């Protein structure tokens, strides 16, 4: 006891030295001292060596390269070591390998074919990822992938020799390449470098850059003349204002130091690891200097040529130069007071080295130096020792001290009370002094046990321990503070650890002591200030850091522990809180995420899990909310933590207390004012604004509030809602959020039209989207704002409807109009789904939903069609469609009209009541529609008729193939109101008789039927009069007019009227019948066909003089013919195939059948081009711009096997050109495509046309063509008229072969010629009238006559009278009509009084076919009933 203490009192004298010096305690002072001694104390060069597979393992304008390298100007270092991985590494291909086997007769990834002349390869120092492969005037930047396999972007040097390039220190994104006169620095982040410098004189020998006292860039070059020059690269010297002349030259006055510095310099290198720089000349002298951090004044200086020292990372003080002349690499290791230089057939070309881990997990440096024979050499701590590097078998001293602790423990536990108590005071003092300084952990344990025993109350042990230790730490820190000396890293760590431990143990006593006054708790604020300064002191780039690890080490852990301490001290004493808030806030807004994120996680863990804690929560909510205005410039990405914290405290928000409800009120009010729902200059929201980003974050916060659902118990009461949710609803409704949202959406309409480790940033911006767009989770401003401005009002409505008390919100019809406008503008799935839910909830009933969207669709489509036609001049006056130029529109206008109209047709197709309703809304749909169909091309007629027929006839009848009946009846009366009689006649004529199609005629019949069957009574009379009037000319439109006959008959037998009218009609019909009969009877061609019909199978009356065009154009059906079986010529190029088909065909569809597709190479998109322009040369029309008319842009999925491209209106084509538009392959000569094979077909029938007309060249060409065709037809005419003689001969007494052989084929030839001739005449007239109107347009007093639509149809581009077929067909139709109209008994009497029985029995008795004759007999029997 007394003797133990007696020896120990002396022992502590050096025991304190051992304990403080032990461990990392004492490392900081030793390191700083050694650094000072290195930079300050003199050293001497010492020659020594103790510091430190076969050849042929290696492979392989070089003359001028030899020249420059001989000039010693440049050299070769072909090596690199990419590791932070295990990557390490003439023919323009160098192999980059791994050396793992050597790492843990050699056993030694990928290779890269270098496309540039290579003298070296340099990895970026901050990041071994990118490597620059370096030559003189060509170099590359390669991002080798994870396995080392080759992307490469080849750097454009624009050489007018580039010495070398360096990626800026710690700047993995920056790099500069310097040549012999100028240096250009570019950032890979942003061709155009961001810096450029040049020299007023001499060459650029060596160029380096470093940091300032703050750390800013400075560029210093040892020139060719040796003049060392310095500059500060900023906005002035940057390449933005141009390459800058170098200005200042640093001074060195040594004994050795005339425009040529001792015969030139050698190099330049300013190590940041040593915090120094070296200097050397082509004289061959070496020296070392350290200079001021801002004055750059060389503070401390010390004294074959030299080149290219290299420091191994994680290997302090080790440098590897190479003698310029001797070629000899030399190693320099510098402790403070000496500079050991060591030198290590196989003429070493280069070397490499890395401080790696050997088989013993020991960081030993391995150096593989490469020779001239391909051989290798293996080569291999002053600052690297643990006592210099920041962090009982040991000390027999610690062993004896442990023995002493055992002795003291025994001398207490078995020692008497008297001795124990008498020695108590001194022993406790000694033990306190012992535990005071840092020492062994086992010493701490033994002392703690002994001292807790010594304290009779272990609570007293803890109390006295807290008081003493805290006082000691506080005094130490306060000395360091008033002193202003920088806090040692481990010092702050140890203090924070100790205080955190004591606070976690006994926070109340901690508050009492750290609060007792030996403002409030200045230790806390001073400690935080210390933390801020020290973190500001962090080594910026850890690579470029000085030999020590400056700044915090386990930074986030220190932050979390400090937060624990601060929160505890705040909790224990309430009156400090107003401070702590701001303190924490300055941290919860710090720049680097390492502070803010760690603090947010810390606090969330901190306040998490009586009334005391809730009160602390409320007070914090008030305090931070006041500082909420400070985030005005925070930046959204640098602001999510605050809101995460607000919600985090809001986790247990029970507003039930009047105070608690008041708290909710303050929160909601502050947030709402922060958003500012009443700005009214909302157009500023369009751009991405910092306050805008913060605002959006706040909105997402309020949304996580409203969407918060405090799901209750099993009870079905509708009032178990989150009080936070109810409040958010109430406040947003009070703030008029609807109008703000709507003004935002309208304001965004402009942009919408114009557009055509990861931090756990949950829950504001989700983790997945973080993974997907880690660039900036506040970057997608427009889309996120749109999503929010939608998804808020829906939830607002959810609460609003759900609340019994609150009357519902009211948004005006602008809501429907604007949201529907949003829907039609395209958007991705999220926007679409949200908008749909919004409209559906808003408009209540799904019927109303679909109806409203439909009406919008129709309104847009009609507006679009009207504007399209107006772009061609067509103008509706009030209800009078008028046109000025009557030309036919090109394909562009037609595809335009067809797209919109067909869309409308599909819409009306889904259901009819919608089309009926939309039409009932606007009275400007019908007459415009019919007027448009009257002028539009024929191929567009079927669609327009389908729509109009759906409108008036309706769904019941059309599908068959009261409310809707009323709609149809009213709309029929409407059409009656708007229609003009002349237009009605023009419609009947154009679409019932003249049309060539069958479906067109059928639909015409349906529309006429339904319109007539329901028009007004007197309207019915008007229609009957008009139709029976037009029937007088039925001879001309002739054989195609069956529909009109049927319609006239139905109208006749259904409608009763005055006998004068009926008599008039009967007179008309009888006269027509008689005249047609007579025209039949005197026919010169009557005899021959008359005889021949009863002899051979008479198919067609092939004995007409001027071919009846109506009889001469049957309806050839579209045949599904393969694109193979029509070809005439084919060819291919790199990516296209040109085929010249047999002849002009009207293609409506085409199908690509794909065989044996290649997974490596697929074609996604294809562009098809048609051309119907005259060409006999395959090469001539391969010009894509001239001879390609695009058809349909078709892109499919990869692997798609059957494609069906159908032109909306069929295209008339001759030469087709198919190109594989987009990919996901055609050979030059034969076009073999090893990807696959393709086949094609088309549902087409031939089309008889010519070349389109373009120029007077076409005028002469076509005139000649038509003339020649006329010659051919003339030969046909003479020869064919010749058959009449021999035909008469065979008639006099074979004939099958005679005419059925000849006459048929003859008529075939003449028909081909005639059809071609007519089409050609049409084309010539088209060009004539088009040039006429165009040249007439220039005349200004000549206002081009706006021709009516009827004038237009007659203006724009009939069976021949003496056609025995025409007369016969007229007879058949007339017989049908007569056998019909006789049915009225009064009509029986009237027709009998006509006495036509004579005419029929006499003229048409045996005429007509079998069926014709039989019907005739039936009629004759009937007429005398």
Residue numbers in the entry: 1808 to 1859, 1865 to 1872, 1881 to 1904, 1909 to 1913, 1917 to 1931, 1939 to 1942, 1945 to 1986, 1988 to 1997, ...
Sentences from the study reporting this entry:
Among the >600 human ubiquitin ligases, UBR4 plays a particularly important PQC role, being an essential and conserved E3/E4 ligase found across eukaryotes. Aside from teaming up with various ubiquitin ligases, UBR4 activity is linked to two specific cofactors: calcium-binding protein calmodulin (CALM1) and KCMF1 (13, 16, 17, 20, 21). Our data show that the evolutionarily conserved UBR4 complex forms a megadalton E4 arena, in which inward-facing ZZ-DZB domains of KCMF1 act not as E3 ligases but as substrate receptors. The architecture of the E4 megacomplex is conserved across eukaryotes, but species-specific adaptations allow UBR4 to perform its precisely tuned quality-control function in diverse cellular environments.
